[PDB]
């Protein structure tokens, strides 16, 4: 940051000599991990795609990433996860039924 030192405007506020604290591990609560990558990958190829996930990749190959999202968005909760879900599908498609 660095604050202007006045009480309006862009970096509004008091100039204090700053510190920057040690990072909290909760804050790394989402993070991957080698153990989880492995098990999720394994489980995936064990248990294989689910109905909506099949309708999803054919929708891609046959209609584009935009019809895919629009539907994935209804199927899942939201637009954002729909994005993530299509991307994942893409990466199934590519990594597999290609190279």
């Amino acid at each position: 940051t660095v604050k202007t030192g006045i009480a309006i405007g862009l970096n509004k506020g008091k100039k204090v000599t700053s510190m920057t604290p040690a990072p909290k591990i909760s804050y790394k609560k989402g993070a991957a991990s080698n153990r989880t990558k492995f098990v999720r990958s394994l489980v995936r190829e064990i248990a294989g795609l689910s109905p909506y996930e099949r309708r999803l990749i054919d929708l891609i190959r046959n209609s584009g990433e935009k019809r895919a999202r629009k539907v994935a968005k209804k199927r899942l909760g939201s637009f954002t996860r729909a994005k993530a879900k299509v991307e994942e599908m893409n990466n199934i498609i590519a990594a597999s039924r290609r190279h």
Binding site: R40, V43, A47
Partner: peptide
Amino acid sequence: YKYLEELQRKKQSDVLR
């Protein structure tokens, strides 16, 4: 247990149903 956990999250998968 960690495999059990992840498996159970695939309720629509051929095997779980």
